[PDB]
Amino acid sequence: GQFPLTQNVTVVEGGTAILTCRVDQNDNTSLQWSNPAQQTLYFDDKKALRDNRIELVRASWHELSISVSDVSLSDEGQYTCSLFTMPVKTSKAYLTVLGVP
Amino acid sequence: FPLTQNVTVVEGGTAILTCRVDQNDNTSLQWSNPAQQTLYFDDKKALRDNRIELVRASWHELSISVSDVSLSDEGQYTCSLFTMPVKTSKAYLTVLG
Numbered sequence: 573g574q575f576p577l578t579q580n581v582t583v584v585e586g587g588t589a590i591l592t593c594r595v596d597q598n599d600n601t602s603l604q605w606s607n608p609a610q611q612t613l614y615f616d617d618k619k620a621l622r623d624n625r626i627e628l629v630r631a632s633w634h635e636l637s638i639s640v641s642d643v644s645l646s647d648e649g650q651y652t653c654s655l656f657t658m659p660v661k662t663s664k665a666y667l668t669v670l671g672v673p
Numbered sequence: 674f675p676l677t678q679n680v681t682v683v684e685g686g687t688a689i690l691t692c693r694v695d696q697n698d699n700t701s702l703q704w705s706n707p708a709q710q711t712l713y714f715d716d717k718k719a720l721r722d723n724r725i726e727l728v729r730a731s732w733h734e735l736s737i738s739v740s741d742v743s744l745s746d747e748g749q750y751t752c753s754l755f756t757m758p759v760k761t762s763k764a765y766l767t768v769l770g
């Protein structure tokens with residue numbers, strides 16, 4: 573229904589992760605990604621946090637997807653997608669970063 | 674260069690939160706609440722609490738109004754300026770009963 577859906581992601585240190593938040597049924601209602609520190613990454617199609625590694629895969633009413641390139645072990649953690657229905661709905665994607673053997 | 678200030682409001686009253694940037698190009702401002710929920714991202718409303726309104730948004734100022742305040746609204750609101758790296762200024766909202 574009108575609920576944000578995300579999945580856990582696993583990526584190798586140095587590789588590129590893609591975090592995807594989807595909504596089955598939606599209008600206008602805005603989506604937003606934040607990082608483990610709760611800082612905003614994108615608000616719909618508008619970049620927030622300047623970090624040149626974080627870029628926009630897709631922004632629409634049904635999808636908000638972002639790529640983190642050249643990931644490091646310190647990107648590991650819980651990312652949150654928020655959809656601004658009243659009350660707000662959230663869904664978490666835990667990003668795991670594997671070291672190179 | 675984000676600059677905000679502590680604000681006092683009597684319970685049931687309306688508080689205004691103002692964030693100021695002395696010189697700015699086209700870098701974004703965002704207010705968020707003590708839970709860290711985004712309220713306004715520039716002129717774009719986020720959290721849907723219909724008590725929260727936009728007073729003013731431009732590159733030099735982001736101001737929002739909280740009408741009808743309650744005791745649970747008390748605390749640290751943060752203004753963010755998305756420079757590289759990000760800069761923040763907190764305003765503390767005191768609500769008296």
Ligand SMILES: *[C@@H]1O[C@H](CO)[C@@H](O)[C@H](O)[C@H]1NC(C)=O
Pocket residue numbers: 580666
């Ligand atoms: C996603 O990751 C967290 C990491 O601890 C975990 O609790 C959760 O179960 C994971 N999702 C699953 C198992 O579907």
Ligand SMILES: *[C@@H]1O[C@H](CO)[C@@H](O)[C@H](O)[C@H]1NC(C)=O
Pocket residue numbers: 600601602
């Ligand atoms: C989307 O458009 C509506 C019209 O119903 C506009 O008034 C409103 O601000 C937007 N609503 C959102 C973002 O929830």
Ligand SMILES: *[C@@H]1O[C@H](CO)[C@@H](O)[C@H](O)[C@H]1NC(C)=O
Pocket residue numbers: 679764765
């Ligand atoms: C704003 O409020 C907090 C905590 O009550 C305080 O630490 C800060 O100094 C305050 N602002 C002033 C004194 O202007």
